[PDB]
Write an enzyme that holds these catalytic residues in place. Structure first.
Site, PDB file in Angstrom:
ATOM      1  N   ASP A   7       8.718   8.071 -15.199  1.00 42.99           N
ATOM      2  CA  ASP A   7       9.707   7.008 -15.376  1.00 42.99           C
ATOM      3  C   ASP A   7       9.033   5.645 -15.487  1.00 42.99           C
ATOM      4  O   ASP A   7       9.287   4.882 -16.433  1.00 42.99           O
ATOM      5  CB  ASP A   7      10.702   7.030 -14.214  1.00 42.99           C
ATOM      6  CG  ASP A   7      10.018   7.030 -12.860  1.00 42.99           C
ATOM      7  OD1 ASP A   7       8.794   6.795 -12.807  1.00 42.99           O
ATOM      8  OD2 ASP A   7      10.706   7.273 -11.848  1.00 42.99           O
TER       9      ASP A   7
ATOM     10  N   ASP B  38      18.038  23.557 -17.083  1.00 41.07           N
ATOM     11  CA  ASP B  38      16.782  24.243 -17.360  1.00 41.07           C
ATOM     12  C   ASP B  38      16.785  25.692 -16.899  1.00 41.07           C
ATOM     13  O   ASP B  38      16.054  26.512 -17.465  1.00 41.07           O
ATOM     14  CB  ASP B  38      15.617  23.508 -16.688  1.00 41.07           C
ATOM     15  CG  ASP B  38      15.347  22.153 -17.310  1.00 41.07           C
ATOM     16  OD1 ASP B  38      15.958  21.159 -16.864  1.00 41.07           O
ATOM     17  OD2 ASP B  38      14.524  22.080 -18.247  1.00 41.07           O
TER      18      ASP B  38
HETATM   19  O1  LIG Z   1      12.109   2.897  -4.540  1.00 43.92           O
HETATM   20  C1  LIG Z   1      11.843   3.936  -5.446  1.00 43.92           C
HETATM   21  C2  LIG Z   1      10.637   3.587  -6.263  1.00 43.92           C
HETATM   22  O2  LIG Z   1       9.505   3.334  -5.358  1.00 43.92           O
HETATM   23  C3  LIG Z   1       8.216   3.118  -6.102  1.00 43.92           C
HETATM   24  O3  LIG Z   1       7.102   2.988  -5.200  1.00 43.92           O
HETATM   25  C4  LIG Z   1       7.174   1.712  -4.562  1.00 43.92           C
HETATM   26  C5  LIG Z   1       7.860   1.860  -3.241  1.00 43.92           C
HETATM   27  O4  LIG Z   1       9.241   2.261  -3.469  1.00 43.92           O
HETATM   28  C6  LIG Z   1       7.849   0.595  -2.467  1.00 43.92           C
HETATM   29  O5  LIG Z   1       8.389   0.850  -1.156  1.00 43.92           O
HETATM   30  C7  LIG Z   1       6.445   0.022  -2.318  1.00 43.92           C
HETATM   31  O6  LIG Z   1       6.516  -1.258  -1.660  1.00 43.92           O
HETATM   32  C8  LIG Z   1       5.381  -1.422  -0.804  1.00 43.92           C
HETATM   33  C9  LIG Z   1       4.172  -1.774  -1.620  1.00 43.92           C
HETATM   34  O7  LIG Z   1       3.765  -0.626  -2.417  1.00 43.92           O
HETATM   35  C10 LIG Z   1       3.017  -2.171  -0.779  1.00 43.92           C
HETATM   36  O8  LIG Z   1       1.968  -2.664  -1.635  1.00 43.92           O
HETATM   37  C11 LIG Z   1       3.371  -3.253   0.231  1.00 43.92           C
HETATM   38  O9  LIG Z   1       2.224  -3.523   1.055  1.00 43.92           O
HETATM   39  C12 LIG Z   1       2.358  -4.821   1.639  1.00 43.92           C
HETATM   40  C13 LIG Z   1       3.161  -4.707   2.900  1.00 43.92           C
HETATM   41  O10 LIG Z   1       4.540  -4.390   2.561  1.00 43.92           O
HETATM   42  C14 LIG Z   1       3.152  -5.961   3.692  1.00 43.92           C
HETATM   43  O11 LIG Z   1       3.808  -5.720   4.952  1.00 43.92           O
HETATM   44  C15 LIG Z   1       1.738  -6.455   3.957  1.00 43.92           C
HETATM   45  O12 LIG Z   1       1.799  -7.679   4.711  1.00 43.92           O
HETATM   46  C16 LIG Z   1       0.670  -7.733   5.586  1.00 43.92           C
HETATM   47  C17 LIG Z   1      -0.433  -8.485   4.908  1.00 43.92           C
HETATM   48  O13 LIG Z   1      -0.901  -7.708   3.768  1.00 43.92           O
HETATM   49  C18 LIG Z   1      -1.578  -8.737   5.815  1.00 43.92           C
HETATM   50  O14 LIG Z   1      -2.519  -9.599   5.146  1.00 43.92           O
HETATM   51  C19 LIG Z   1      -1.144  -9.398   7.114  1.00 43.92           C
HETATM   52  O15 LIG Z   1      -2.214  -9.471   7.952  1.00 43.92           O
HETATM   53  O16 LIG Z   1      -0.046  -8.633   7.796  1.00 43.92           O
HETATM   54  C20 LIG Z   1       1.097  -8.392   6.900  1.00 43.92           C
HETATM   55  C21 LIG Z   1       2.078  -7.497   7.595  1.00 43.92           C
HETATM   56  O17 LIG Z   1       2.504  -8.106   8.785  1.00 43.92           O
HETATM   57  O18 LIG Z   1       0.972  -6.621   2.677  1.00 43.92           O
HETATM   58  C22 LIG Z   1       0.954  -5.380   1.886  1.00 43.92           C
HETATM   59  C23 LIG Z   1       0.304  -5.660   0.564  1.00 43.92           C
HETATM   60  O19 LIG Z   1      -0.985  -6.172   0.776  1.00 43.92           O
HETATM   61  O20 LIG Z   1       4.567  -2.870   1.055  1.00 43.92           O
HETATM   62  C24 LIG Z   1       5.721  -2.512   0.214  1.00 43.92           C
HETATM   63  C25 LIG Z   1       6.832  -2.029   1.096  1.00 43.92           C
HETATM   64  O21 LIG Z   1       7.225  -3.065   1.958  1.00 43.92           O
HETATM   65  O22 LIG Z   1       5.737  -0.094  -3.638  1.00 43.92           O
HETATM   66  C26 LIG Z   1       5.757   1.162  -4.402  1.00 43.92           C
HETATM   67  C27 LIG Z   1       5.180   0.901  -5.760  1.00 43.92           C
HETATM   68  O23 LIG Z   1       4.420  -0.277  -5.720  1.00 43.92           O
HETATM   69  C28 LIG Z   1       7.929   4.247  -7.084  1.00 43.92           C
HETATM   70  O24 LIG Z   1       6.782   3.889  -7.879  1.00 43.92           O
HETATM   71  C29 LIG Z   1       9.074   4.508  -7.990  1.00 43.92           C
HETATM   72  O25 LIG Z   1       8.786   5.694  -8.784  1.00 43.92           O
HETATM   73  C30 LIG Z   1      10.345   4.732  -7.233  1.00 43.92           C
HETATM   74  O26 LIG Z   1      11.425   4.838  -8.163  1.00 43.92           O
END
Ligand SMILES: OC[C@H]1O[C@@H](O[C@H]2[C@H](O)[C@@H](O)[C@H](O[C@H]3[C@H](O)[C@@H](O)[C@H](O[C@H]4[C@H](O)[C@@H](O)[C@H](O[C@H]5[C@H](O)[C@@H](O)[C@H](O)O[C@@H]5CO)O[C@@H]4CO)O[C@@H]3CO)O[C@@H]2CO)[C@H](O)[C@@H](O)[C@@H]1O
Lengths: 720, 70, 90
Positions: A460, A138
């Site tokens: 993407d 680009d």
């Molecule tokens: O990798 C490149 C790619 O990424 C895309 O975006 C992604 C991102 O990469 C991911 O890391 C991400 O994953 C996270 C989720 O988004 C998120 O919703 C989730 O949240 C969880 C959490 O992980 C989990 O620990 C939690 O547990 C708790 C319970 O909810 C409670 O009830 C309880 O009391 O305690 C536990 C914890 O002890 O729950 C929540 C959900 O409620 O965590 C994920 C990471 O671990 O997602 C992204 C997209 O969704 C991007 O879009 C791309 O462009 C890119 O290429």
């Protein structure tokens, strides 16, 4: 015979997972019913905020955990692929592949990495007549052109050696800079001398490329001039004609041994002032068009500058996946796991992020396949143009949808591929130059509903979702070797900016027309579970808005309210225990079948909490502002720092206030302090590294200061 | 040790002497045995983990809550 | 220098070479080496260092390499081909 096999979990780790997650859901439902009905807690606002935030968390978790249902594994058979399709003794019957590489500017990233990835692309294990590489820029800088010119000669020198000795990785820099024993399983008698000579040649090429890079930093006032003695067409970045060049092709140079090398096409688009050009959507789309004119390949493998091909078998495995009449008909792209290198033992940054790539991506593979991420994907050309799965589930119309050029329409009308005319290559070059014109995409459906979905920042995932809504299916293949390794950010500002960009793109997609909540609802062709997973991936940043409030709750509860919830031995404590044990057993059992290290899950969840605290919060606020209309890392760290300070001051002050009492807080003080300790333990490790010089030992002075401040608070409480 | 530890708390500080003697022998055995078992079931000896600490303290609350309730 | 046995003459030779390979007109800079032990080992080491400097000075002054001390330069794990543009450097 089946070239690839897809077997589910052995069922020794899947049914217990299903049972435990169902039990967790039932326990959560009972917990929430009891919380809604029985307790009041003597305070309305605080309890209402706590319960509403907990319910939001429960909805988020239940909508996020379901996509992991039904994990699936896969393996491919290159031996049988070669046995059948190679057809030794007769001409090969392997489909063509078009590798894409896009660059923005040579100053931001050195051209050495671009040359290394170009060499890795040019040194794949595939018939030379099939693989074809394309490089787009680009910035239209002459430094990149000269670097590619030198890389052409270096590839001419390097390809026979690599292809003869089957060395890996194919990238010269990332291969020579390896401390693993290079003489491990090599049986070629004359390997040592050839390796030494090739290393010396590579050092000389590195010196030449460094000389070119150093020269490029000085800009003459007359402008750039080529060796032939002609002004560089790309003098002004804003205004310059588009240029197409060919190297290492059948028309160009050949290998030392006399064998031909894959053709490399260097394309620079035509840009003019007052014309809207997209950052990367308008570059990859132009690459697709120009490839459709030059070498119509049914399969387009997209990549980035940083990422290179690790092993010379990714293309063969993609062919194995996409060639089966049964499991190769409905496939649209084969997403690959993008693995990174240069990781220290203390991966505090959590830049690896493989829990998502392994636990979640494989889980989603079972239903409808993974999502396009932006690297390592072999898109189907017909799928990219947009036709729907074969055997689902006018000329003026073709002009309107594809473009005014008739040559491109004629070329894309062919399902098999290739060039039908097979003559007048120079006229084909002129036709390509015309096709890459700036005004080609004016009223056509390019990008809007055909190619890379035009978007302000992130496209993407949008393109993957749009092409999945049409009934396509995608595959997820994990080779033993990563097969796609690239350099990763090593500092914190870049990582924070990247996560902020992802959150902003997700919010923009949510607020745009392509909203899964009310999009793709005509004709089906989209699994309900896949739509649920898409909703999860789109509205994940919104959990930050309740998360900030929830993590703020304990600080106020421990100072002003001084209460959490009444404890009943019979039912409330039992429900608390059930939830607490269920979550941990579920986590352990999930980790059992994914081969993930236990520390990785904790690191990832704390990183997610941090991102929700700062990155997602700022991204969602910016999204509201942009929607209503129609940042530095220091600013990004304000919410985390504020929360850390408020929580620590609150916990210490409340600890002193409970100590002053006559041992009447023996239960409530622990109950109130546990949540604050949880929040502080999740948050402090991140802040320590950015404000600390090392993660091995934070400091010893901060401990002295903390104890002296505790003495200060105690003395002030005693005196007042 | 954890079960008896809680059972000593319920008493009216009558185990100030006996508890330490009994606990010390258990600590001696555990401290010798634990480091070995950590490495084979752990990925590194530099840092065992932080999750097990979370589980242990939560498990400590588990026994403590049950004792208070039963 | 005090005595060559307590500290090896190699370090003294490296320091002498670094002194002799500074970026200053040759007619201005002048190096002086004194010894209290009056040992022949130091004299022979300096005699050999004279030839080694005769060999090393043009290379260092032409390629602008740093640090000028050979023992402390060759034993560096930093990428030695970082910003060198001389075609025949390797
Ligand atoms: O990798 C490149 C790619 O990424 C895309 O975006 C992604 C991102 O990469 C991911 O890391 C991400 O994953 C996270 C989720 O988004 C998120 O919703 C989730 O949240 C969880 C959490 O992980 C989990 O620990 C939690 O547990 C708790 C319970 O909810 C409670 O009830 C309880 O009391 O305690 C536990 C914890 O002890 O729950 C929540 C959900 O409620 O965590 C994920 C990471 O671990 O997602 C992204 C997209 O969704 C991007 O879009 C791309 O462009 C890119 O290429």
């Amino acid at each position: 015979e089946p070239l690839s096999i897809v077997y589910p979990i052995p069922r020794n780790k899947l049914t217990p997972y299903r049972a435990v997650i169902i039990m967790r859901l039932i326990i959560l439902g009972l917990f929430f019913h009891y919380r809604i009905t029985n307790p009041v807690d003597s305070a309305f606002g605080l309890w209402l905020t706590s319960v509403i935030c907990e319910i939001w968390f429960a909805f988020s978790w239940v909508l996020d955990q379901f996509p992991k249902w039904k994990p699936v594994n896969r393996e491919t058979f290159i031996e049988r692929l070669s046995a059948r399709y190679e057809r030794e003794g007769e001409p090969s019957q392997l489909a063509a592949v078009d590798f894409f590489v896009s660059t923005v500017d040579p100053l931001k990233e050195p051209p050495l990495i671009t040359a290394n990835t170009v060499l890795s692309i040019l040194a794949v294990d595939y018939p030379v007549d099939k693989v074809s590489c394309y490089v787009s820029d680009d910035g239209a800088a002459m430094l990149t052109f000269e670097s590619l010119v030198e890389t052409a000669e270096f590839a001419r020198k390097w390809v026979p050696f690599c292809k003869k000795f089957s060395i890996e990785p194919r990238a010269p820099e990332f291969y020579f800079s390896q401390k693993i024993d290079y003489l491990k399983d090599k049986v070629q008698p004359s390997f040592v001398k050839e390796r030494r000579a090739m290393k010396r040649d590579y050092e000389e090429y590195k010196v030449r490329v460094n000389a070119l890079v150093a020269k490029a930093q000085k800009t003459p006032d007359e402008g750039w001039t080529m060796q032939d003695g002609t002004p560089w067409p790309g003098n002004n970045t804003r205004d310059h004609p588009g240029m197409i060049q060919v190297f290492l092709g059948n028309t160009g140079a050949r290998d030392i041994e006399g064998n031909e090398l894959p053709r490399l096409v260097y394309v620079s688009r035509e840009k003019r002032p007052g014309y809207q050009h997209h950052k990367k959507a308008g570059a990859e789309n132009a690459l697709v068009r120009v490839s459709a004119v030059l070498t119509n390949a049914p399969y387009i493998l997209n990549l980035d500058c940083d990422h290179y091909v690790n092993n010379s078998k990714a293309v063969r495995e993609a062919m194995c996946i996409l060639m089966d009449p049964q499991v190769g008909r409905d496939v649209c792209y084969v997403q690959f796991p993008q693995r990174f290198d240069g990781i220290d033992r203390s991966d505090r940054y959590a830049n690896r992020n493989i829990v998502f790539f392994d636990v979640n991506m494989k889980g989603l593979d079972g239903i409808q396949g993974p999502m396009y991420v932006g690297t390592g994907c072999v898109f189907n050309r017909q799928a990219l143009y947009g036709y729907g799965p074969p055997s689902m589930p006018s000329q003026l119309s073709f002009e309107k949808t594809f473009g005014l050029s008739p040559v491109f329409i004629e070329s894309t009308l062919m399902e098999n591929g290739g060039v039908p005319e097979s003559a007048n290559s120079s006229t084909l070059i002129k036709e390509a130059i015309h096709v890459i014109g700036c005004g080609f995409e004016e009223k056509t459906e390019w990008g809007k509903e055909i190619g890379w979905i035009y978007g302000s920042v992130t496209e993407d995932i949008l393109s993957g979702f749009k092409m999945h809504c049409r009934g396509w299916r995608s595959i997820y293949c994990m080779p033993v070797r990563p097969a796609f390794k690239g350099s990763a950010p090593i500092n914190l500002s870049d990582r924070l900016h990247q996560v902020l960009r992802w959150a902003l793109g997700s919010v923009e997609i949510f607020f745009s027309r392509h909203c899964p909540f009310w999009y793709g609802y005509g004709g089906g062709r989209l699994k309900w579970l896949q739509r649920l997973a898409y909703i999860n991936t789109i509205v994940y940043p919104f959990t930050s808005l309740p998360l900030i409030a929830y993590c703020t709750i304990p600080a106020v509860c421990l100072l002003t309210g001084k209460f959490i919830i009444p404890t009943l031995s019979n039912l409330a404590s039992m429900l608390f225990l059930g939830l607490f044990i269920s979550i941990i057993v579920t986590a352990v059992l999930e980790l059992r079948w994914s081969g993930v290290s236990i520390e990785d899950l904790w690191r990832n969840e704390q990183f997610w909490v941090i991102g929700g605290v700062s990155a997602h919060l700022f991204a969602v606020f910016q999204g509201f502002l942009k929607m209503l209309a129609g940042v530095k890392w220091t600013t990004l760290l304000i919410p985390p720092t504020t929360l850390l300070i408020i929580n620590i001051v609150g916990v210490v002050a409340g600890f002193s206030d409970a100590l002053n009492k006559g041992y009447e807080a023996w239960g409530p003080l622990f109950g109130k302090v546990f949540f604050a300790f949880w929040v502080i333990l999740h948050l402090y490790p991140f802040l320590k590294g950015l404000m600390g010089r090392q993660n091995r030992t934070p400091t010893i002075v901060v401990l002295w200061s903390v104890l002296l401040t505790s003495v200060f608070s105690l003395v002030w409480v005693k005196i007042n």
